[PDB]
Amino acid sequence: LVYTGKYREDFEIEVMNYSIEEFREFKTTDVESVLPFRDSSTPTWINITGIHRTDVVQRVGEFFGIHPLVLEDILNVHQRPKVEFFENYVFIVLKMFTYDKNLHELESEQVSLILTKNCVLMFQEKIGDVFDPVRERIRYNRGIIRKKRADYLLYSLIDALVDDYFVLLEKIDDEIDVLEEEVLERPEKETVQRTHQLKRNLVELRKTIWPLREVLSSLYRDVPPLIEKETVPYFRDVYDHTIQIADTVETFRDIVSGLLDVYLSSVSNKTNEVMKVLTIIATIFMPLTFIAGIYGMNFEYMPELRWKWGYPVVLAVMGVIAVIMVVYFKK
Amino acid sequence: YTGKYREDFEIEVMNYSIEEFREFKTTDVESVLPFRDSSTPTWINITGIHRTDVVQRVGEFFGIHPLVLEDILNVHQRPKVEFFENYVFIVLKMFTYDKNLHELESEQVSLILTKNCVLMFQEKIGDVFDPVRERIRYNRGIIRKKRADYLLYSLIDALVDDYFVLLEKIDDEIDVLEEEVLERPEKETVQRTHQLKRNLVELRKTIWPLREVLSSLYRDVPPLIEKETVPYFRDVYDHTIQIADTVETFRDIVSGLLDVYLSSVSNKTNEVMKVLTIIATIFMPLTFIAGIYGMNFEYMPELRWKWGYPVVLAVMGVIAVIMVVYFKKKK
Amino acid sequence: VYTGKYREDFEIEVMNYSIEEFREFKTTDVESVLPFRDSSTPTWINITGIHRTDVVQRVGEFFGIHPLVLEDILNVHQRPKVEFFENYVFIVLKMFTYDKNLHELESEQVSLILTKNCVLMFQEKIGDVFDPVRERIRYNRGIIRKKRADYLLYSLIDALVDDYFVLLEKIDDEIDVLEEEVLERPEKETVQRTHQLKRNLVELRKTIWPLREVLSSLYRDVPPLIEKETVPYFRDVYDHTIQIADTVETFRDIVSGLLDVYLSSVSNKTNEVMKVLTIIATIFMPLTFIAGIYGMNFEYMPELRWKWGYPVVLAVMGVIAVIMVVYFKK
Amino acid sequence: YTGKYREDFEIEVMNYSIEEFREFKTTDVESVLPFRDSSTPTWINITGIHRTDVVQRVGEFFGIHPLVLEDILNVHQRPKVEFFENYVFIVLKMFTYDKNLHELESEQVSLILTKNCVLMFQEKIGDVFDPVRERIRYNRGIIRKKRADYLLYSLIDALVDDYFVLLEKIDDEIDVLEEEVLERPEKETVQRTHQLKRNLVELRKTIWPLREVLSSLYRDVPPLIEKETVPYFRDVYDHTIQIADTVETFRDIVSGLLDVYLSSVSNKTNEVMKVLTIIATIFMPLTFIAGIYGMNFEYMPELRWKWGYPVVLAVMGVIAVIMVVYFKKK
Amino acid sequence: YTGKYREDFEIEVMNYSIEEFREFKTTDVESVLPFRDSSTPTWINITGIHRTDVVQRVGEFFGIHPLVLEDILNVHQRPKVEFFENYVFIVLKMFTYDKNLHELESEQVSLILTKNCVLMFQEKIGDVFDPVRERIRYNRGIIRKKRADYLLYSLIDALVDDYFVLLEKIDDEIDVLEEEVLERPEKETVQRTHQLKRNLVELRKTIWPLREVLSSLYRDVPPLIEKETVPYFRDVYDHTIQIADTVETFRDIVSGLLDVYLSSVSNKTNEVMKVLTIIATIFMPLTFIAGIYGMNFEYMPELRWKWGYPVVLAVMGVIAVIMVVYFKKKK
């Protein structure tokens, strides 16, 4: 039982119990008070913020009889999300992703959950979640959520996280748009260096999403303890969506991949543009300077003074050759 | 009001019925207010929303939230749908692209439909609702026999058709760009292509999230009657699919057209250097030789041989020429 | 609404068979293919020229098909998928064809609705890869007669799968030319031809990659038809679309390598020209400077005062350009 | 017939049992025909595939499909498994690589195993089945007790084992190619980088679909018996995965190897440019100064001073020194 | 023996049961041979497998196949599984990387497990089974009660984490290699990048065929208890799949980092070309001027025009200045 996370600071527990009629929400850090709520027939939603506590999670696991290694996997922040089936409860690991717009970094928070009977356990490492509008329907008695059990509520929680990826796709696309904008406009390698790290966050993103597909698929075609013919068919809808999601993400990966050579060639293009300017310079003075060197060379005979006006006659022939090539240029 | 148009100001009210119709243009804010209690759906035109006194008065007259009033003042906003018990706030944009230069102006069109009032907030003069005003005037369609619920979409359908023409505007410029890239390529073509894509991405930047905007009033519409605009948005959503796909097609066309001109010029980099080289190679070695006799010594090679003015210039010239055979060869 | 480019040709053919015999005919009658719905024997029906929105509707209304599904058929631009029901199964397919001369891949959407034992094939123009399949249905070759429409349609789809393998050859045929074009005598505009191939390569992923789960959906479901029969046969074909996409993914790295080759030789021959230009200009730079000082105007002329100054200067600066040749190729 | 060998022609027949053995070399087509009814395991060598009359005569004597017999003439066909009623048709390919000159020669040999007879359609003389013939001749192992169904594996294993040596032939030249890249890089290195990879691409392009050739029988073998020699196929069935992974490994190494070379060339490109820059630029303003004094005006400020000729030569020298100080930065 | 270690010599034999325990290192072979007949699991180590006489002695005494005994001598072998009626021959590898340098040393490990006894064959000194021996020494877990089939598995899992630590060592070299590219990128970086790259694929080159090794044991193992072959063996087979993505990630990193480094070279080159450009453009046009007056002709305007010398000094300096204003922008 070792928590290798980055947040051992705050700790908070919130419990929301409700039926198809009544409703109650409260925040009790008392571990003993939330124990008899397991026997409640009504769906009991329990929040645990700050999963860093090795004694609290264990104590909760002791009363529920949760497997020791499972309690350790929760504390393990370095783990791929997956789902394990059991005779009583369901072991599920999820990952909440967040991306700041100013600085470019993908911050995350592992969220594991265990659902038995009608008990709902949401585990957090810190403050923040996207299940706030979900609590609204639980509070305002909105929709068929109350009439449906925690199995449908879990999906409402699953789809709530899925919708965040769409919002993330908005962020991803926006960052790409700004990134590809600087490619043609600014021939400077600054965000281009940050592009690889931004693309690194994109690769690691799909690296979690792709196996998460099979994580979901293991539920619908199985779910031994959960009910059937209702939840699974309706829930597969999101499973049909998450397939479409990463495929759009995979498309983004190929776009940024070949975008590097676009900027790379753009640098050489503007570099060549400098060379083209540099080209026409040394090609018009050097041959004419060569002529100036000829008259600069003294000899025993000088027909320049013998011929009529040998000085201004040279000033005319030089200026012509430098112009007749200009037409040939800019072709 | 964060807009750039605080010049023009105009308020028009076009109230109709199942038979007759009336219209008038009054600058008085208090004159367009008592038409709220009109049994028939009242259509109101508001051009030049820069005047905050109208936003404040009417806002407090219809009972509009101060932040919602600020949303109208905010000319930079993403299209969405705000559900309330009184009205429905929707952000819309009017795009106008000139074929002369790649530029697309965007005038935000907010709307607040409560009771029997239909508000159209314009930032400046110009819209596509002019032929729509005729149907309200000439009694054309079931727009007269229906309330503000159908009157709302009657405006939307015109705005939807505006993008179809815009697609033609782009497609026309695409064919021009196709004639500009595939053949007769030149400078600033990329700049025209970039700004076109910049407007193309910005186009979808409003249209793509506008899909879910249509989905907001697709399965809902709580206060007004439904199953009327539902098959409408069902057809409208089929339109925006082809729109973005036409955009997505052009987005890859842009890249396809870009890579050609980008790789070609970057490939001609060495070609320019090849020309620059063979021209510069016949300068530096010859330039020094011409400057040799421009020096003073103890002996003169001119008097060493008869007719010492040619100083063997023809021979050295030929030797400079023979280098060509050495060049031009396969590298 | 049919938005395709083929509203000309039209053909209807019905190929019914049993575990022993077989029958086939080509009639344009719409009311003749309808009473063959209740036929227990597997009935393969052809519909070429899907442009007719009235025929599809008429046939669709008789089968009790959802109006939108009929409209999905009319739509010629659609991603391949599978729609499960309690009666029929709507599956979207595609037929890709590439011409070697002008680099372009034409496409034709194939929709099908299989109920009971009846088989429906919806096309636009003439031509398909089900021709050798029809032979076994006609010549009674194998268990293609005994097995119903569950394995028949599977054999039809599997026949379509191998068509893309032939297309992969056609892609490789262009690669072999691309291998010849880029390397042997590097030519301009090849990058454009390369990008078009790359654009068509990624375009191919738009169909095949989601087609994986299309086969996977039929792999562990099939609610209306009998399961367990053709289910394990779906596995091999499901491994094909994965193997194909890997070959498509493989082509991405192959062409990308050749893409830089054309730029490699140019960049390689670039410095080759520069290396020659380098040693030429630099060595004559200090030499030109020296000879200018003598004939120039100064307040002191120790040059003529130097004993034998003329011959020594000419040869003392010659070695400087020679020692660089030793430095050359280091 | 699309073959390239219409020169040599030879037919050898080796027959054996669980006790004895017999062999004879008769190029006659009508002489090896009555050996079809031989209950004992028979092995027949068929070299001289150019003969359209000899091959088809033996083929039609066995009752083999005409078009199939016509396909034997063609030496251009994908390696696969043709399932029949008794015999199975597989065209095995062999790739020989000479280390000196980068070249991958391809000989395509087809086999037909009917009853107890074994056919081997060679294109030329020479194979790796020579030690295989020895065990048939010298009674070595269970090659005598077991029939041709097990011998067929010994034929395959003898062919596959050559590819392991073929990988060594490539790996040998890879290490040689490494020496050309790691040190002393030059022209044609990119060619050797490709020509070795070109044949390597051609190699896997044949082996990768040849992997499923094994799987076609390893999971089935419909005409003959099973449960024998089948688990032995699994050994080689892992070899084609072992080889391809080694091939795929080489494909990634060679690709990255050329990238290093291209990176080196581009790096050494600027390296020459850097030398060209720091040497040419420092003499540009120097030569300009000498031309100034070369001018002859009416007023000479030089003679106005007193012995400033070495002064000019000294002040210009220091300016060229700070260029190195101006260097060592980016 | 085709190895490089014919120097070191070490033999370790460890027997244990559900009650007692005994560990020792005896060079006497005839003392550990009857220990095979013991029902209690006897783990035996043979370091310095170069000695063919011992392999021929121990091997032929157990009836081990002669060619297999020679296969051990061959250090160039693919990791595989050889099933027999009594024992099982498995080829394994132990990779090790040293920091502050680029070198990946390897050591082939062959094992022959008969009855309950385990034979481990080493090439050189060193293993990660040191803490494993301690758990058997201190009676930790059910490793004492279970037989060799689980004992070998305990050795397998010990080898798994060894590469996991090595995966951390890779990233340690990456971050250093990254820093080399992230800031002040220089020559020989491609070489260092290749050193990791050449060892990157080489790592997975042996891992992939070592995966089916775990699978082959998971499917068959006829002589040992198949009850022990629970998904724990496939759990090990699941870890290597994560290694595949871990290596594949590094493959994308190495490919990307090398490109970013090479992309900077274009900026490195251009930076030099910018300085190289502005030099020749401000001297040669002025050099041509000095060459004219430096050249002698017929008519001399220098002595003709008043102040011939100071009048030329002014115009030359301005020409180099008027270009600066044109410069310092996008060329």
Swiss-Prot record, chain A:
Effect of residue 283 to S: Abolishes Co(2+) uptake
Recorded GO MF terms: cobalt ion binding; cobalt ion transmembrane transporter activity; identical protein binding; magnesium ion binding; magnesium ion transmembrane transporter activity
Domains as described in the record: The central ion permeation pathway is formed by the first transmembrane domain from each of the five subunits. Mg(2+) binding strengthens interactions between subunits and leads to the formation of a symmetrical homopentamer surrounding a closed ion permeation pathway. Co(2+) binding also induces a conformation change. Low Mg(2+) concentrations trigger both a conformation change within each subunit and a loosening of the interactions between subunits. This results in an open ion conduction pathway. In addition, this results in a less symmetrical shape of the whole complex.
The protein, known as: Cobalt/magnesium transport protein CorA
Principal location class: membrane
Extracellular side: 298-308
Effect of residue 272 to L: Abolishes Co(2+) uptake
Result of changing residue 298 to A: Abolishes pentamerization. Abolishes ion transport
Membrane topology of this protein: Multi-pass membrane protein
Effect on the protein of changing residue 289 to L: Abolishes Co(2+) uptake
Quaternary context: Homopentamer. In the absence of Mg(2+), interactions between subunits are weakened, and dimers, trimers and tetramers can be observed in vitro.
Gene Ontology biological-process entries: cobalt ion transport; magnesium ion transmembrane transport; protein homooligomerization
Result for mutant: residue 311 to F: No effect on pentamerization. Increases ion transport
Protein species of origin: Thermotoga maritima (strain ATCC 43589 / DSM 3109 / JCM 10099 / NBRC 100826 / MSB8)
Effect of residue 275 to A: No effect on ion transport
UniProtKB/Swiss-Prot annotation, chains B, E:
Effect ascribed to mutating residue 300 to I/L/V: No effect on pentamerization. Decreases ion transport
Motif (Probable selectivity filter): 294-296
Effect caused by changing residue 303 to V: No effect on pentamerization. No effect on ion transport
Annotated phenotype, changing residue 303 to A: Impairs pentamerization. Decreases ion transport
Activity modulation comment: Inhibited by cobalt hexaammine.
Listed result of changing residue 296 to D/E/T: Abolishes pentamerization. Abolishes ion transport
Catalytic activity: Mg(2+)(in) = Mg(2+)(out); Co(2+)(in) = Co(2+)(out)
Residue ranges that the UniProt entry lists as topological domain Extracellular: 296-306
Effect of residue 277 to L: Strongly reduces Co(2+) uptake. Abolishes Co(2+) uptake
Site (Essential for ion permeation) location in chain: 270
UniProt effect for mutating residue 309 to W: Abolishes pentamerization. Mildly decreases ion transport
Mutation effect (residue 300 to A): Impairs pentamerization. Decreases ion transport
Biological function: Mediates influx of magnesium ions. Mediates Co(2+) uptake. Has high selectivity for Co(2+). Alternates between open and closed states. Activated by low cytoplasmic Mg(2+) levels. Inactive when cytoplasmic Mg(2+) levels are high.
Assembly and binders: Homopentamer. In the absence of Mg(2+), interactions between subunits are weakened, and dimers, trimers and tetramers can be observed in vitro.
Protein name (database record): Cobalt/magnesium transport protein CorA
